[PDB]
Symmetry: C3
Subunit: 358 residues, 3 copies
């Protein structure tokens, strides 16, 4: 395309002061800079690269067809939650995998969704704001299937009364979590048939094709380079800031991940198209909940690393109410600003409980 | 009727190879056959007898009237869950009573209901499939009254902190469970007035009358003969198969019980009448939940046998999500196949958690 | 007004035999009467004074305007739950504050609401009974925000496994409860703008003005005089009746408090206006849940008294099901008598569990 949209669209992001963070993460590695600065200049280097992957992926959709063009249009908003989950599972920091994959479900149900209803409720306060229910009820049937897979290994850990030690109940949680994962991958392959082929009918570009595959390695081998620096240097970056590792992982780190889905769900909220702001905010809390999370169990199954679906007692109660307050909000096909301020303030309640949790 | 429908309708079951299991359970008793074979040839002998009672009971409805013909039409699908619960309560195997009466609630909410939506969604994928909400909302108000009676004696067992030993909190669970049962029998007598008399309007035969009372003892004193053999020989039949007694009782045994309600809820799903497949699958999880279960407490109250509504922590969390995922599925009066595959896969999640639970 | 409605309207209460209980509480103080009688003649002295405040407050609404006349019309039904909560927090009986503010949420969701549907369902059984959903969905979004603030300090108390003693986890519950309260007062100030100003349009008197301020001190300094006698003499009045202090506080004491809201929600149920019986029964379980309860934490924050949002395990499970069975009842805008009998019998289940709880 003769180097024209290769310089303008790269400088055509609504956030573009974050591009000099990328040279100040490799150079600061080979100079002996202390580890909080490498952590500060790696989150600010993945924030436009989480968008430039999740925008240029749509540019390859117009060169494939109707089948794959319904798949890659709705599967690569989560190409940063996947790389950080695998470059922390192989580094044996298994707890950070359980928080960043939980904070990407809560941010897509409370902060992303409850800003499309608030900011796109005040601008359109003198119009009627309608979406459809049948298009986004399937996204809540699957999250209640995911919650049952997280509830049951939690309650097995509190069965120490029943004449069993810890070595029995730990290989009982680990056996049923490695069997719930195959059941969770089947209710997402079936979802990717209902959404694409069977019920499609009830449901131009600017860039050349050869550009779209060159950059989507040049914007992926830089996410995989910086996702090591976030994982391998999160401990000293949690002792010089006086923050907990169960707050950086669950609150600050999903903001870098879900920043592509958080300017697409808001711009289509000012345009009064809330069918689209519910496809981005809900259809990406299902890909995390039922394809990205049970795939980590299967990769741990192969590598010999122990990992089960036990998040914890305080993390599961936040997951249970996030699905119930979202379901009762979206059950009549009409919205206003007070539906979205209740979802924001339920996210400032979770964000206090982990700021104190030391 | 001159021995004509007495030989044709008896041979007129869609499952009729299970009739020679009945002679091979009495003869194998008086020959010293080892106890797994008596257990194998007793479940296969109760499967057509759970249907021939729950079909010939409708034949007596056309000889009584409108009042009783709305009662016996909807009260004797559960004439096998009642005999096995009483022929195990008097044999002091109280735990098997708590599993088989729970696995008859889960099978009617997930496996019976989620097959009428899946098998009757693929055949009618090119039509619109509608039921009514007001006819089956009362069935969920009562199950939330039943769940509160099971939640509260569970949480009293975890109040050992409050300066009370086990002998105090065991006669505190036992006192409130014997008072919740009278409150549960009143919200089912009131349901049998709302359904029959007060709101009836908003809601031929082939066999003679004298045939219909002869067989309905000859098909009931054979259920009561074989329900002893299932109860008194479940222990050695759980050591020669390497299965748990909390899997045989909760999964394999309700399949023999709910096999009359599992070919009537499916044939009316191919006929695109989902008002009727929701009256069989939901109106029989309410008779178990609010008439068969609180009647066992009252019979234990009279016989001096200690029994309360405490199922357990792992069994109550499966009961809580089964009511919530069923309520959010049925709240718009329209169905398709993906609503029923989520209910089947939530039953293959419960069936793993108890296959491992040794 | 020349002493005419000052004698007729004071004698114009539908309960007026309870007025001689007021002289028999001050005289019995200065005569050495034993403390159960002062407790018996103080609940019967606050029952017409909980009504005469919550009726004459509407008489001052017609002398202020549209703004304040939407506020005092809906903020002083709870002028007795507030005085008893503060005259027990300063007397260091902190547990009674946690029960009487819980039994005012349960009575407004089950006993007040489930009598407007039952008594106003039998009188209007031959008509169709409709309310609106959008007017009373906001009242359930806020109660799910209140429940998350009560769920999370409960689960922190069961984190004694995580290498922390009791002195760590008690100043961890106390820190997050004093930060959840500011988040709860903001989602009620925002509710008092949505209800009054922004969405008003989608949503004579008999007494002079100068009468309305004289009596509303003369009916408030008698509530504050008798609310000391209920608090300071509840212990011996729970040893001469053989009742628990977690039954008098949660069942018998809210009946005196919610007796103004329990003849206004019933008379508008016989008149077939269920938009109004849902504004009294639901809009007063939100003022308790999100303005009266988080204000007690802030007053305890200033006075140096330790108080957090931890009610208990058995009290939170009763709060969780009370919101779920109320939400599934009111989701179609139509009512009948069987919706209200299920809500009454769920209140006779809570009232047994605390009658035994000694
Ligand atoms: Ca993302
Ligand atoms: Ca049955
Ligand atoms: Ca009140």
């Amino acid at each position: 395309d003769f180097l024209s949209n290769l310089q303008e669209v790269i400088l055509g992001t609504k956030l573009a002061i974050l591009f000099p963070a990328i040279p100040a993460a490799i150079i600061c590695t080979y100079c002996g800079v202390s580890q909080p600065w490498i952590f500060g200049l790696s989150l600010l280097g993945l924030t436009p690269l989480a968008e430039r992957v999740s925008f240029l992926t749509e540019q390859l959709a117009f060169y494939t067809g109707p089948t794959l063009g319904g798949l890659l249009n709705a599967t690569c908003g989560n190409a940063t939650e996947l790389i950080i989950a695998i470059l922390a599972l192989t580094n044996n920091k298994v707890a950070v995998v359980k928080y960043s994959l939980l904070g990407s479900i809560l941010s897509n149900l409370l902060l992303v969704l409850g800003t499309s209803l608030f900011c796109g409720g005040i601008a359109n306060i003198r119009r009627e704001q309608r979406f459809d229910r049948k298009q986004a009820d399937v996204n809540f049937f699957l999250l209640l299937l995911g919650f049952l897979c997280h509830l049951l290994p939690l309650l097995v850990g509190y069965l120490k009364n029943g004449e069993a030690s810890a070595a029995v109940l730990s290989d009982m949680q680990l056996s049923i979590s490695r069997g719930f994962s195959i059941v969770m991958l089947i209710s997402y392959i079936a979802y990717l048939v209902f959404q694409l082929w069977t019920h499609r009918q009830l449901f131009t570009a600017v860039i050349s094709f050869w550009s779209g595959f060159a950059w989507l390695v040049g914007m992926t081998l830089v996410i995989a380079l910086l996702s090591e620096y976030v994982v391998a240097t999160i401990e000293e970056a949690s002792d010089k800031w006086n923050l907990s590792v169960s707050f950086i992982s669950i609150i600050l780190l999903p903001i870098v991940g879900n920043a592509a889905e958080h300017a697409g769900a808001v711009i289509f909220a000012f345009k009064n198209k809330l069918d689209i702001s519910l496809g981005v905010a809900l259809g990406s809390a299902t890909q995390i909940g039922l394809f990205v999370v049970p795939l980590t169990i299967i990769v741990a199954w192969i590598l010999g690393i122990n990992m089960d679906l036990n998040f914890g007692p305080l993390e599961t109660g936040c997951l249970a109410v996030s699905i119930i307050i979202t379901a009762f909000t979206l059950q009549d096909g009409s919205s206003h600003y007070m539906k979205g301020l209740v979802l924001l303030l339920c996210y400032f309640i979770i964000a206090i409980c982990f700021f104190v949790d030391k």
